[PDB]
Design an enzyme around this catalytic site. Structure first.
Site, short mmCIF file in Angstrom:
data_model
loop_
_atom_site.label_atom_id
_atom_site.label_comp_id
_atom_site.label_asym_id
_atom_site.label_seq_id
_atom_site.Cartn_x
_atom_site.Cartn_y
_atom_site.Cartn_z
N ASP A 142 0.84 -1.19 0.00
CA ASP A 142 0.00 0.00 0.00
C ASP A 142 0.88 1.25 0.00
OD1 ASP A 142 -2.11 1.75 0.07
OD2 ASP A 142 -2.68 1.34 2.14
N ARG A 146 -0.25 9.40 -0.02
CA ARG A 146 -1.02 9.63 1.20
C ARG A 146 -0.43 8.89 2.40
NH1 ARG A 146 -3.84 5.80 -1.80
NH2 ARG A 146 -4.14 3.83 -0.66
N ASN A 147 0.37 7.84 2.15
CA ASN A 147 0.95 7.03 3.21
C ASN A 147 2.43 7.34 3.44
OD1 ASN A 147 -1.52 5.71 3.62
ND2 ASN A 147 -1.05 4.13 2.10
N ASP A 160 1.77 3.53 7.54
CA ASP A 160 0.57 2.75 7.23
C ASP A 160 0.93 1.34 6.78
OD1 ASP A 160 -2.09 1.92 6.38
OD2 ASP A 160 -2.57 4.06 6.30
#
Ligand code: QP1
Length: 308
Positions: A142, A146-147, A160
């Site tokens: 992932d 955004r992470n 994350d």
């Protein structure tokens, strides 16, 4: 030939930290910001506390604890490490506070003040963190803008690890972020360190487009076909062919002919040695450094609090 994971899981008293503000809620539970003062230490550490809301019939604690297992086993200047958990009525995760937020929002709210030096340095730092995750045989699954959290504009870290999975000495799963996944991960649900390289390529494209949505306005189901058709993301405007060529190599169908994270570090480090030759940005500018509210005399950032 698998090493014993001797990472320490520190249990923290609820007395030891004070919430201050809500940084966001919904979905999971709530993510707070606050200070952690270990008793008998005379230090105040800015932390981010993430608890599971209404854990009265959840059984998603098997998910939050899996993240805590992973976050407690990592130690790299470009990876978020767990500071500790708190086993109150709601399970809480405590990590180091990243004041400037995730890199995806930061790249949007500062697109008129981000220089090629910053963009190329971020791409090196993300690649370093990912190369470290490859050393520890961990697949992120992932990776996205955004992470990636921004401690300072000059220091970002990968975070994350919910979907993160530890390989042995090619993981098969069965909710996913479609537009960031390698072709094999779509059709065969195979995740390798080279499947992360694809997601790294999409992450670099997020930064050079200053936060555009990949495949914006396309349905998720049609992505599996257009990728087999030989289509990729466009060349961002500020991107020379040098930078976009690296982005293209991450999106090759043959997974073993993609760049290794140890190589992506070297190519972007060479470009960070002369940033304006590889990223054309109108007007290459400065970025900020902060004490916030109360008595901040004994404040220590978490990267300098090391208890063995
Ligand atoms: C863009 C997504 C984002 O998180 N932005 C953001 C905005 C403001 C912040 O503080 C000023 C931070 N700092 C931060 C956030 C987290 C974290 N975020 C999430 S989900 C998105 C909600 O936005 C807060 N989960 C966490 C978290 C993971 C593990 C853990 F142990 C505790 C919290 C972590 C650290 N710093 C980010």
């Amino acid at each position: 030939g698998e090493a014993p994971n001797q990472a320490l899981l520190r249990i923290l008293k609820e007395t030891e930290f004070k919430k201050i503000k809500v940084l966001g809620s919904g979905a999971f539970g709530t993510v707070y910001k606050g200070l952690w003062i270990p008793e008998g230490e005379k230090v105040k550490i800015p932390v981010a506390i993430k608890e599971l809301r209404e854990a009265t019939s959840p059984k998603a604690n098997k998910e939050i604890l899996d993240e805590a297992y992973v976050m407690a086993s990592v130690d790299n200047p470009h990876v978020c490490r767990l500071l500790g958990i708190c086993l109150t009525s709601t399970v809480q995760l405590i990590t180091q506070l990243m004041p400037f937020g995730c890199l995806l929002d930061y790249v949007r709210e500062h697109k008129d003040n981000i220089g090629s030096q910053y963009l190329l340095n971020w791409c090196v730092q993300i690649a370093k963190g990912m190369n470290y995750l490859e050393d520890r045989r961990l697949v992120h699954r992932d990776l996205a803008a955004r992470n990636v959290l921004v401690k300072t504009p000059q220091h970002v870290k990968i975070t994350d690890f919910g979907l993160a999975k530890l390989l042995g000495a090619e993981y098969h799963a069965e909710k996913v972020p479609i537009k960031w996944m390698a072709l094999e991960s779509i059709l065969h649900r195979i995740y390798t360190h080279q499947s992360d390289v694809w997601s790294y390529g999409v992450t670099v494209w997020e930064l050079m487009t200053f936060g555009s949505k990949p495949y914006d306005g396309i349905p998720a189901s049609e992505i599996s076909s257009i990728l087999e058709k030989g289509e990729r993301l466009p060349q961002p405007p500020i991107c020379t062919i040098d930078v976009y060529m690296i982005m293209v190599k991450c999106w090759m169908i043959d997974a073993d002919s993609r760049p290794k994270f140890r190589e992506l570090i070297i190519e972007f480090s060479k470009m960070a040695r002369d940033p304006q030759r590889y990223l054309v940005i109108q007007g290459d500018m400065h970025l900020p450094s902060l004490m916030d509210e109360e008595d901040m005399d004994d404040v220590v950032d978490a990267d300098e609090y090391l208890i063995p």
